[PDB]
Coordinates of N, CA and C in Angstrom, one line a residue:
X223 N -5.9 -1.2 15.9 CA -5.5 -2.5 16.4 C -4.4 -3.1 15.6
X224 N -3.5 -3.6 15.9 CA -2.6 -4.4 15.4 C -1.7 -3.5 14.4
X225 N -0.9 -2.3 14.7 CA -0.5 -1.3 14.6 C 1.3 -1.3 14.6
X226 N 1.6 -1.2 13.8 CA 3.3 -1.5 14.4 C 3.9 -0.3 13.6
X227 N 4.9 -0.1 14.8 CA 6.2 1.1 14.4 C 7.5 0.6 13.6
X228 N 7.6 1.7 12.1 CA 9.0 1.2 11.7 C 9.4 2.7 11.3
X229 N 10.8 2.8 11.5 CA 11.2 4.1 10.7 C 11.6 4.3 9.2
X230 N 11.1 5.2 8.5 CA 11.6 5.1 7.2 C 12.1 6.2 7.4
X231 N 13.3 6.8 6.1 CA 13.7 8.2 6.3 C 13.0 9.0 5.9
X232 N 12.8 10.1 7.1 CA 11.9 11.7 6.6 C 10.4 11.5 7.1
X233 N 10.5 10.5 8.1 CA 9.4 10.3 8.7 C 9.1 9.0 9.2
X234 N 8.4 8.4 10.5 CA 8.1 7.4 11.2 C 7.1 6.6 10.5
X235 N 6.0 5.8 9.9 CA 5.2 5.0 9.9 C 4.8 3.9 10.5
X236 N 3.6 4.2 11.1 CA 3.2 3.0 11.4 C 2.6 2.1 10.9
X237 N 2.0 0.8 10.7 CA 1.5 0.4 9.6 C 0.8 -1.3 10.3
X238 N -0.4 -1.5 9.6 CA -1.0 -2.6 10.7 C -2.4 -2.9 10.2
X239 N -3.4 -3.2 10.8 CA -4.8 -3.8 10.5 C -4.9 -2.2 11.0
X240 N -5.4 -1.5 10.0 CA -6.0 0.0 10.2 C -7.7 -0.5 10.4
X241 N -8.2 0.3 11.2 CA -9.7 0.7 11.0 C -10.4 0.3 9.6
X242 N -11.5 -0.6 10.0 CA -12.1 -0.2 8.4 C -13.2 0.6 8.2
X243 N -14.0 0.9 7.0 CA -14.7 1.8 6.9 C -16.5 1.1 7.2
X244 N -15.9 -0.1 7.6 CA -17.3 -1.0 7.6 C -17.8 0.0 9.5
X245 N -16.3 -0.3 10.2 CA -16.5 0.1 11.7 C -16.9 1.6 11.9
X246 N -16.1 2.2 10.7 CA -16.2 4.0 10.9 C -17.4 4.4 10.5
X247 N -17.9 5.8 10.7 CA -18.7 6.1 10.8 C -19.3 6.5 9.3
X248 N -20.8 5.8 8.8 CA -21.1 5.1 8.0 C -22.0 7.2 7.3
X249 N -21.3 8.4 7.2 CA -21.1 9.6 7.0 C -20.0 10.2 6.2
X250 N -19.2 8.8 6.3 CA -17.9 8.8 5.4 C -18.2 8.4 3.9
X251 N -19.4 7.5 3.9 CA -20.1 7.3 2.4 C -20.3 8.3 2.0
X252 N -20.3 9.7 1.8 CA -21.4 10.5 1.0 C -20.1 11.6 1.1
X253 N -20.5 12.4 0.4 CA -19.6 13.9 -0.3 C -18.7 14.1 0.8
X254 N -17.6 13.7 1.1 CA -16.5 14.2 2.2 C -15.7 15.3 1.1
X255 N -15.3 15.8 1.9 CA -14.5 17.7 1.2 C -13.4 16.5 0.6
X256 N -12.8 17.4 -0.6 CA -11.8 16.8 -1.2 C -12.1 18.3 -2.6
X257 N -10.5 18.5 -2.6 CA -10.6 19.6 -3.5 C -8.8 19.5 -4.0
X258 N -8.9 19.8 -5.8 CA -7.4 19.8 -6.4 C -6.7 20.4 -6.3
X259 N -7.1 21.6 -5.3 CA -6.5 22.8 -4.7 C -5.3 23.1 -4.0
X260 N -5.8 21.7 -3.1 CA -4.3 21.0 -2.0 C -3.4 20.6 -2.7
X261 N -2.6 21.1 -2.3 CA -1.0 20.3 -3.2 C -0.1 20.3 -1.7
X262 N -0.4 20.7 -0.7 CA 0.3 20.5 0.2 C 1.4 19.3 0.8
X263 N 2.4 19.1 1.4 CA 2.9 17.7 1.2 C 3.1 17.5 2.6
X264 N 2.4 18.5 3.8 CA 2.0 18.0 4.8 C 1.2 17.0 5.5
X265 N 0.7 16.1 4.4 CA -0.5 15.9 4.4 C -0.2 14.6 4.6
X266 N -0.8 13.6 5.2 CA -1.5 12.0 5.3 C -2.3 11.3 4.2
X267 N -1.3 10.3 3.9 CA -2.1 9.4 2.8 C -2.5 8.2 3.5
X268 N -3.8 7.8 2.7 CA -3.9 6.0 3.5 C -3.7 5.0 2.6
X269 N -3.0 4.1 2.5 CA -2.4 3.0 2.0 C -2.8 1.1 2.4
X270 N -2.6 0.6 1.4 CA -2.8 -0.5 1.4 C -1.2 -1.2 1.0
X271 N -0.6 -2.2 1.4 CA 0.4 -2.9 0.9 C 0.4 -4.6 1.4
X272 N 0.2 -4.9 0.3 CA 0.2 -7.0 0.0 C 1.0 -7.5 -0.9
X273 N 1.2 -8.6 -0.8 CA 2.3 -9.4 -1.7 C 2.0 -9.4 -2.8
X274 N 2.2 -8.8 -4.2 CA 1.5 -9.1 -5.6 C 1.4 -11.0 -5.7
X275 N 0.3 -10.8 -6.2 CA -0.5 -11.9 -5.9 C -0.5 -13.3 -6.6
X276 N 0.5 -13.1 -7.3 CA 1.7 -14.6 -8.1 C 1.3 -16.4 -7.7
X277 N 1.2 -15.9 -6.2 CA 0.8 -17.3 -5.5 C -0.3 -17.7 -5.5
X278 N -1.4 -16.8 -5.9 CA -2.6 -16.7 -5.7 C -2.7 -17.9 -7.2
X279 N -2.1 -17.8 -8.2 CA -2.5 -18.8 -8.9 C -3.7 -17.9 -10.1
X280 N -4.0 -16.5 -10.0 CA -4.7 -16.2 -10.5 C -6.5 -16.4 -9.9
X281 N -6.2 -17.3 -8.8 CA -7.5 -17.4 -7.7 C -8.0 -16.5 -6.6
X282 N -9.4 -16.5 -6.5 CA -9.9 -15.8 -5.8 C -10.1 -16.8 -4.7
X283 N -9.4 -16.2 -3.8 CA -9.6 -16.9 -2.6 C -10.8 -16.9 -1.6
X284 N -11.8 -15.6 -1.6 CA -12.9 -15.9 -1.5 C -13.7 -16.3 -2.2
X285 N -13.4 -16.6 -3.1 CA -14.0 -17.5 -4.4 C -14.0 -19.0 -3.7
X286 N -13.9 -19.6 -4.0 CA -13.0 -21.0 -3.9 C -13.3 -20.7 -2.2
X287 N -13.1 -20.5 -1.3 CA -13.2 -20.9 -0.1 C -13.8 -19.5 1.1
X288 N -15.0 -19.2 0.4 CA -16.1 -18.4 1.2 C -15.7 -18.4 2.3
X289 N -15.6 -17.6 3.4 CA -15.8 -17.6 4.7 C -16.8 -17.2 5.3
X290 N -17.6 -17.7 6.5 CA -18.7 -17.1 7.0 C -18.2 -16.6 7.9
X291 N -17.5 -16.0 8.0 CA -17.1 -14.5 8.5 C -16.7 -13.0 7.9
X292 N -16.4 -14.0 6.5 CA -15.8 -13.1 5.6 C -14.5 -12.2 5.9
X293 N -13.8 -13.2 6.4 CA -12.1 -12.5 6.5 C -11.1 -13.0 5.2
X294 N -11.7 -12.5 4.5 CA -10.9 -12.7 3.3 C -10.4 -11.4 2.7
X295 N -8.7 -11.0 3.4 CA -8.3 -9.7 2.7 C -6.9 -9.5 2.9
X296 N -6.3 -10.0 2.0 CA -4.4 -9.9 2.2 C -3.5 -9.0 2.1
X297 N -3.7 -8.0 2.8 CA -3.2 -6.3 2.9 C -2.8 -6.1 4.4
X298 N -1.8 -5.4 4.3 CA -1.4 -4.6 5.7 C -1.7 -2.9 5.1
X299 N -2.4 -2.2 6.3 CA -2.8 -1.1 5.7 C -1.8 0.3 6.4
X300 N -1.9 1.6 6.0 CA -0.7 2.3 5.9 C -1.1 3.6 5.9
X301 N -1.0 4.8 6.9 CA -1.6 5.9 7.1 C 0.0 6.5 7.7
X302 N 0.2 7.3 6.0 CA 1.6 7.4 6.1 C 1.7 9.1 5.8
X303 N 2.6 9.4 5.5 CA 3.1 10.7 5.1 C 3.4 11.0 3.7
X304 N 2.5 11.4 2.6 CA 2.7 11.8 1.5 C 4.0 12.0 0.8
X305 N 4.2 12.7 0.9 CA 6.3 13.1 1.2 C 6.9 11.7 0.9
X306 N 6.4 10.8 1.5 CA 7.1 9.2 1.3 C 7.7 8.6 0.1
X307 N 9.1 8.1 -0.3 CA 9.2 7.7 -1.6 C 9.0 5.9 -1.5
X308 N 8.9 5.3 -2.8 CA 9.0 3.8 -3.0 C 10.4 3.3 -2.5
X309 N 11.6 4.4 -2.6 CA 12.8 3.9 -2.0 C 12.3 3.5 -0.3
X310 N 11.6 4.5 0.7 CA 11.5 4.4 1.7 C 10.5 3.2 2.2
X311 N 9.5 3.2 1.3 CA 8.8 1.9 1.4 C 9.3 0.3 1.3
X312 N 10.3 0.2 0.3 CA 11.0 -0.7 0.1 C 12.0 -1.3 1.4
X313 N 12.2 -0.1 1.5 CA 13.3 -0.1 3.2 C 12.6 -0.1 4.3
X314 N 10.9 -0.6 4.3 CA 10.0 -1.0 5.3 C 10.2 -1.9 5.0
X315 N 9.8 -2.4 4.1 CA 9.5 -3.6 3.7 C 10.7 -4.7 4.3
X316 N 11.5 -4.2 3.4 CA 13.2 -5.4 3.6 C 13.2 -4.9 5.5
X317 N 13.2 -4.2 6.4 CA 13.4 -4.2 7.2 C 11.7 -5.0 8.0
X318 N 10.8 -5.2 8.0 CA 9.4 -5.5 8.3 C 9.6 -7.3 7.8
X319 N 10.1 -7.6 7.0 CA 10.2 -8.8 6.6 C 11.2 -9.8 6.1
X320 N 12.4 -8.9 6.9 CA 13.7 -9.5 7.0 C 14.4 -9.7 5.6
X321 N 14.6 -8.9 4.7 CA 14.5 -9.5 3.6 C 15.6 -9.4 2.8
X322 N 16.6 -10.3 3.1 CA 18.0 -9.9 2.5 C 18.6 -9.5 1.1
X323 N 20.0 -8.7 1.2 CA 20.1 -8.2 0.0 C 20.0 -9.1 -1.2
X324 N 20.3 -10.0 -0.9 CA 20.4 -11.5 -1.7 C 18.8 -11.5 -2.8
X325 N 18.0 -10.5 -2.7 CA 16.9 -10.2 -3.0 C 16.5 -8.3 -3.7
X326 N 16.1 -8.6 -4.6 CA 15.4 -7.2 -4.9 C 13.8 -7.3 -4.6
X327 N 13.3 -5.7 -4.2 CA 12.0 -5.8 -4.0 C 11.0 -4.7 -5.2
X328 N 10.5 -5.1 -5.7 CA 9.6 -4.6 -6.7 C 8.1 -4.1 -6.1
X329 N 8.3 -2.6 -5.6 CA 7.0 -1.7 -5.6 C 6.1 -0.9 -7.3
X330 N 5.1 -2.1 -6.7 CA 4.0 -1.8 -7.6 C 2.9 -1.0 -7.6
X331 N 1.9 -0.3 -8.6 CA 0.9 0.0 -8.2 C -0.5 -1.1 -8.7
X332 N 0.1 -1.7 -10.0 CA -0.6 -2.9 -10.6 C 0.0 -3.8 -10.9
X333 N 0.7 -4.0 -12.2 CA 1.6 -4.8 -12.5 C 2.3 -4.2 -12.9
X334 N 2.9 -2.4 -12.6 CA 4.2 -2.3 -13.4 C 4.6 -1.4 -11.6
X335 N 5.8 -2.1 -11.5 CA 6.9 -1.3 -10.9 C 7.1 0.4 -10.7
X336 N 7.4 0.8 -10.1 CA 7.6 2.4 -9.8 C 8.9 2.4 -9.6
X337 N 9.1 3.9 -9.6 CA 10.7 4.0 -10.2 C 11.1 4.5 -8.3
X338 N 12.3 4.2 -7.9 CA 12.5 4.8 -6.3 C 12.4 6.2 -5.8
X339 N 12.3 7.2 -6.6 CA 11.9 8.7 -6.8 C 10.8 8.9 -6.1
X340 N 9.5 8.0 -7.0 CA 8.4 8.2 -6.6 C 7.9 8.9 -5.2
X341 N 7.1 9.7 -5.3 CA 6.5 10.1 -3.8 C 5.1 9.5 -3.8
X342 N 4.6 9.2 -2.7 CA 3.3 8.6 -2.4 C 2.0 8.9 -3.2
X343 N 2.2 11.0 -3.1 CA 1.9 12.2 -3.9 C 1.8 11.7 -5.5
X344 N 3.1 11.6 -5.9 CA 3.4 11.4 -7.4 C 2.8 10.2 -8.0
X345 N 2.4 8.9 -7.0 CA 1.9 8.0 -7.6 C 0.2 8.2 -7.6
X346 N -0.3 9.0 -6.8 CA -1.9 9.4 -6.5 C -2.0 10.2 -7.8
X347 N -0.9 11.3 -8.1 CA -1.7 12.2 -9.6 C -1.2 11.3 -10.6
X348 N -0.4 10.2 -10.2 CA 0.2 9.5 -11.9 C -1.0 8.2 -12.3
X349 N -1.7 8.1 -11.2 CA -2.5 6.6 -11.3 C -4.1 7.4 -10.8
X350 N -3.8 8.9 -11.1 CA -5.8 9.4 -11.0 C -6.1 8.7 -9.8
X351 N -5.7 8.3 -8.6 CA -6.6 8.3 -7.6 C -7.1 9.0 -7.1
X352 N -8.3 8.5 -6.9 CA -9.4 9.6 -6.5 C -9.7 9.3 -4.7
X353 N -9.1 9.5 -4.1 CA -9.0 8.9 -2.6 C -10.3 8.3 -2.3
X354 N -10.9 7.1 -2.8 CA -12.1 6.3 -2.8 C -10.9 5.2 -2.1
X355 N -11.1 4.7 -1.1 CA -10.5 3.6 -0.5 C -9.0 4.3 -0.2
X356 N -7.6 3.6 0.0 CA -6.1 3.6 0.4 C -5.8 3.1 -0.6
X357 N -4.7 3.7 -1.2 CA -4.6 3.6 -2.3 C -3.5 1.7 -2.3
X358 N -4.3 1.6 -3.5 CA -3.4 0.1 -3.1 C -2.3 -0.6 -3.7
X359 N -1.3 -0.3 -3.1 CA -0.1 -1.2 -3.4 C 0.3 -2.5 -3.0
X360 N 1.2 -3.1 -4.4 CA 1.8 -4.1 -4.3 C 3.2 -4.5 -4.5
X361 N 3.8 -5.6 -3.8 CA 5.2 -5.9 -3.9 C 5.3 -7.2 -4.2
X362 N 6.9 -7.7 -4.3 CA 7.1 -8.6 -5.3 C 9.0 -8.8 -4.6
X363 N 10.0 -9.9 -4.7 CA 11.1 -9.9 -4.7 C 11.3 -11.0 -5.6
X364 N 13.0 -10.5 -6.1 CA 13.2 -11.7 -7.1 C 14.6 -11.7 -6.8
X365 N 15.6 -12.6 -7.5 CA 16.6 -12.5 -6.9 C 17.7 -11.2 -7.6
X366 N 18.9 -11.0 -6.7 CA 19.3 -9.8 -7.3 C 20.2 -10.7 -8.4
X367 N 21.3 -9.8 -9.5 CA 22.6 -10.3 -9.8 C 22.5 -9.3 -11.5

């Protein structure tokens, strides 16, 4: 649901309110195959991307204002192509959110920046993810000069 097309180079992504794992099939909790064997770069990553969270004040926002629904989650999610660098993510982004040069954009994985080389790959062995959730990124713009 809520799924959108953008092209980055060396591959299409789509990116949007992905499935969650609350809806999928609850078989996905327990020992799914996963082996360090794969180095393949055929392969599909799943991703998370939100605004680093500056505005947030340092606040939990379901803290402070509970929902009884509990839609409290500020991510666009991302089932992308491994192969992918932070340069090409960046060039979603500025193109996804209009975002002129008059601006730099800062891809994160916590609070420190990634260099534009990066592959999707290269940030999963540099930050030990263990594919427990999409892996989660953040961004940031400041001005250029």
């Amino acid at each position: 649901p809520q799924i959108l097309t953008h092209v980055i180079e060396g591959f299409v992504i789509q990116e949007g309110a992905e499935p969650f794992p609350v809806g999928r099939s609850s078989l996905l909790v327990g020992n799914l195959k996963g082996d360090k064997r794969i180095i393949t770069d055929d392969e599909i990553i799943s991703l998370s991307i939100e605004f680093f969270d500056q505005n947030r004040l340092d606040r939990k926002v379901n803290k402070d204002k509970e929902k009884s629904k509990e839609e409290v989650n500020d991510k666009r999610y991302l089932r992308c192509p491994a192969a992918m660098t932070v340069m090409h993510l960046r060039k979603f982004l500025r193109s996804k959110m209009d975002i002129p040069n008059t601006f730099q954009i800062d891809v994160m994985y916590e609070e420190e920046p990634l260099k534009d080389y990066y592959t999707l790959m290269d940030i999963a062995y540099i930050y030990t993810w263990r594919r427990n959730g999409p892996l989660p990124l953040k961004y940031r713009v400041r001005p250029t000069c």
